[PDB]
Amino acid sequence: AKNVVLDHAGNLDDFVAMVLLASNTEKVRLIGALCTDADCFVENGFNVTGKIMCLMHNNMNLPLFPIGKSAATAVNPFPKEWRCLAKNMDDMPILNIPENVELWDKIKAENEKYEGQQLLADLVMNSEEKVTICVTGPLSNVAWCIDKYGEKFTSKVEECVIMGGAVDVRGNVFLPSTDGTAEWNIYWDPASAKTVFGCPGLRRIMFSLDSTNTVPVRSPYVQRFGEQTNFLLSILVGTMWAMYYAWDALTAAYVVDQKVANVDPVPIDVVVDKQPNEGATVRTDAENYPLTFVARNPEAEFFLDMLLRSARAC
Amino acid sequence: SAKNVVLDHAGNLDDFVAMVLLASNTEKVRLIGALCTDADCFVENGFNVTGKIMCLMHNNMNLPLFPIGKSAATAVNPFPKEWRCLAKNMDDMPILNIPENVELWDKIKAENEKYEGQQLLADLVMNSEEKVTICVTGPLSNVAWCIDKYGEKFTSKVEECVIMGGAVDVRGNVFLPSTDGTAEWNIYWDPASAKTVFGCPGLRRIMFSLDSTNTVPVRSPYVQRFGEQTNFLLSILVGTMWAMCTYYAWDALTAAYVVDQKVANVDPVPIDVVVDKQPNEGATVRTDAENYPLTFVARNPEAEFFLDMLLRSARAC
Numbered sequence: 059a060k061n062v063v064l065d066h067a068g069n070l071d072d073f074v075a076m077v078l079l080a081s082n083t084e085k086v087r088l089i090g091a092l093c094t095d096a097d098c099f100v101e102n103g104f105n106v107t108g109k110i111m112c113l114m115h116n117n118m119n120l121p122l123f124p125i126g127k128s129a130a131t132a133v134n135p136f137p138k139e140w141r142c143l144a145k146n147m148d149d150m151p152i153l154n155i156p157e158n159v160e161l162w163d164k165i166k167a168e169n170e171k172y173e174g175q176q177l178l179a180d181l182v183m184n185s186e187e188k189v190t191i192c193v194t195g196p197l198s199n200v201a202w203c204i205d206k207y208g209e210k211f212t213s214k215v216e217e218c219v220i221m222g223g224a225v226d227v228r229g230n231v232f233l234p235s236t237d238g239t240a241e242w243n244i245y246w247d248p249a250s251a252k253t254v255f256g257c258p259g260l261r262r263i264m265f266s267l268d269s270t271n272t273v274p275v276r277s278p279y280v281q282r283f284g285e286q287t288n289f290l291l292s293i294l295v296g297t298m299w300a301m302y303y304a305w306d307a308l309t310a311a312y313v314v315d316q317k318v319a320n321v322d323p324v325p326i327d328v329v330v331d332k333q334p335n336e337g338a339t340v341r342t343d344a345e346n347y348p349l350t351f352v353a354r355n356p357e358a359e360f361f362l363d364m365l366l367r368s369a370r371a372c
Numbered sequence: 373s374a375k376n377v378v379l380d381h382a383g384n385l386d387d388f389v390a391m392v393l394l395a396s397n398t399e400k401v402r403l404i405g406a407l408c409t410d411a412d413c414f415v416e417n418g419f420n421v422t423g424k425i426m427c428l429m430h431n432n433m434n435l436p437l438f439p440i441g442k443s444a445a446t447a448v449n450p451f452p453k454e455w456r457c458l459a460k461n462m463d464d465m466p467i468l469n470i471p472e473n474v475e476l477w478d479k480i481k482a483e484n485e486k487y488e489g490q491q492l493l494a495d496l497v498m499n500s501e502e503k504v505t506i507c508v509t510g511p512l513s514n515v516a517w518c519i520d521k522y523g524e525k526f527t528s529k530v531e532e533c534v535i536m537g538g539a540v541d542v543r544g545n546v547f548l549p550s551t552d553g554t555a556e557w558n559i560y561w562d563p564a565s566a567k568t569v570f571g572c573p574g575l576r577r578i579m580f581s582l583d584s585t586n587t588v589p590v591r592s593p594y595v596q597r598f599g600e601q602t603n604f605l606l607s608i609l610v611g612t613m614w615a616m617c618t619y620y621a622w623d624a625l626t627a628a629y630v631v632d633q634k635v636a637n638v639d640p641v642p643i644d645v646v647v648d649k650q651p652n653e654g655a656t657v658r659t660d661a662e663n664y665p666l667t668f669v670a671r672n673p674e675a676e677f678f679l680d681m682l683l684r685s686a687r688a689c
């Protein structure tokens with residue numbers, strides 16, 4: 059298996075992505091996770107990450123791993139409308155079985171002392187083999203590592219698989235001050251995203267809205283987790299999807315198996331100016347600008363089957 | 373021993389916790405029917421979630437099946453709502469989509485699709501051998517329709533109506549640019565129907581207004597205790613519903629009273645409803661009209677008793 063670190067923002071799909079990575083131990087060795095106070099209040103996101111990890115560790119062969127809270131702060135905050143979703147998951151019955159919460163209470167102190175950004179840097183730089191970073195939240199943490207360590211960090215990254223942006227499709231950030239061209243993860247911290255997408259020597263796979271828009275969350279599919287209620291992960295995943303696109307989950311599925319999508323190189327820049335299109339990921343013709351491999355035409359059925367099967371790991 | 377009960381609800385998360393409380397306490401309650409109104413949910417979703425809960429309960433605790441109808445009631449004041457979706461999410465929850473339960477619901481869904489909720493309530497009440505208790509957790513439109521159509525022929529068959537709604541000596545929860553914050557949502561949705569119900573003589577009414585429901589909030593550590601009971605389908609269900617709206621136990625408290633009146637003492641108050649288009653439209657006010665019908669308003673509910681009742685009830689299966 060290959061080493062993977064999950065850098066997420068604590069929304070429901072970030073957690074479905076976590077389940078996908080953690081459950082596929084033959085292909086992925088999940089060596090760490092960091093949570094950013096973005097799509098969630100870092101507090102609850104950290105706790106849900108820990109509760110899911112402990113539920114899996116006590117039920118399948120998933121080694122414990124470090125979990126760190128990132129110190130990253132937003133340039134433009136997510137809608138408070140969907141930030142406290144990690145708070146709700148923190149209270150779900152399936153994540154509060156006493157034997158699992160007891161394990162989390164026993165290992166929480168070791169994890170509370172990590173600073174997420176430094177943890178991402180250390181896990182990547184100190185690994186024997188290269189590490190794949192699955193980024194389902196903003197790019198603030200990867201940018202921080204690039205700024206502090208440069209090539210000492212990027213040379214140890216196998217690839218960075220990123221959920222974010224919108225290249226040849228409309229974005230999803232519709233506010234009185236914006237024009238709808240930007241996507242939320244990039245809009246949260248444009249400058250950090252600029253740093254990541256313009257870094258030479260860093261291989262980037264980009265799951266922008268171009269690909270995620272083609273694999274929507276539909277009721278008949280979500281109801282199939284009801285056929286697997288003897289599996290804790292199916293009660294977990296079905297409950298989170300029961301609450302609009304499998305953005306982060308698609309991104310993580312690619313990490314598990316690249317047959318999820320073909321990718322095409324595009325030089326991607328980011329608008330960091332305080333304008334209506336702030337956060338937009340745009341094609342640039344600047345000479346020698348670094349290429350990003352944008353996912354295209356994802357294999358929907360393959361992904362949907364992968365998630366249902368993965369949710370039977372325990 | 374058990375008494376006949378009909379649940380008249382609006383499909384939000386607490387309407388469903390109320391349903392589980394009534395249905396799980398078979399020593400005390402015989403649930404003979406339910407109707408769903410297109411108020412705090414899109415009614416088709418509320419209809420399906422009611423059916424799916426009933427079928428899970430029939431297959432796991434022998435709950436007898438009963439008719440479920442969608443009401444044709446339309447709002448006087450619709451919510452400018454972004455929360456009428458907590459029935460849709462629910463319809464897709466894994467614990468309500470177990471094959472053996474979905475198969476049974478699919479088998480009986482067409483028969484229930486044919487009912488019209490308002491007429492169904494009237495028929496359930498009027499054709500019953502023993503009197504019927506109506507637990508109303510959504511707006512009062514359906515009870516009002518029955519009173520308007522059948523009058524005493526309907527009310528004489530009602531044991532009592534236990535209603536969640538209103539605010540008597542505390543502020544309300546309807547905060548809009550044109551309101552003064554003294555009205556509560558179930559009444560504000562259809563004030564005229566509420567006025568009809570509260571002013572009907574010869575109808576016994578118990579009222580769980582914000583005065584009592586404000587005293588029992590949904591708190592995270594208590595909700596997390598349902599995780600100690602995941603071997604019970606109803607604990608995964610109730611816990612999941614209270615988890616996503618950690619909010620008060622408005623409807624659940626109302627249903628708990630139907631199960632055991634020790635949940636709260638009640639005090640008689642003559643209640644009128646503001647129907648004119650004023651800032652306090654929908655408010656429940658104490659009227660001084662001579663000989664006006666009394667409503668028994670719940671006071672100082674037994675919170676610990678209620679919280680224990682719900683955790684216990686959720687171990688029924």
Ligand SMILES: O=c1[nH]cnc2c1ncn2[C@@H]1O[C@H](CO)[C@@H](O)[C@H]1O
Nearest residue numbers: 069071140194221241242243305306
């Ligand atoms: O409406 C929403 N609800 C929950 N999460 C959302 C929503 N919109 C965006 N994201 C979050 O931002 C990225 C996609 O733009 C994904 O990483 C997702 O977690």
Ligand SMILES: O=c1[nH]cnc2c1ncn2[C@@H]1O[C@H](CO)[C@@H](O)[C@H]1O
Nearest residue numbers: 277278416420463478481482483485
């Ligand atoms: O009466 C009905 N019978 C069968 N399905 C129905 C009915 N009403 C709504 N649906 C809905 O249409 C799809 C199934 O054809 C499902 O989405 C179901 O929720």
Ligand SMILES: O=c1[nH]cnc2c1ncn2[C@@H]1O[C@H](CO)[C@@H](O)[C@H]1O
Nearest residue numbers: 543546547548549550551552553554
């Ligand atoms: O008690 C109250 N609390 C909060 N807002 C209120 C209350 N009463 C009336 N409004 C009104 O509803 C809008 C905010 O939702 C404001 O326009 C305010 O005038």
Ligand SMILES: O=c1[nH]cnc2c1ncn2[C@@H]1O[C@H](CO)[C@@H](O)[C@H]1O
Nearest residue numbers: 384386455509536556557558622623
């Ligand atoms: O903020 C809210 N979210 C969801 N349901 C609500 C909210 N406020 C009120 N109710 C609904 O209206 C009655 C209490 O006024 C209860 O019947 C409850 O189901």
Ligand SMILES: [Ca+2]
Nearest residue numbers: 067072194195
């Ligand atoms: Ca995310």
Ligand SMILES: [Ca+2]
Nearest residue numbers: 382387509510
């Ligand atoms: Ca209600």
Ligand code: NI
Nearest residue numbers: 416419481485
């Ligand atoms: Ni239908």
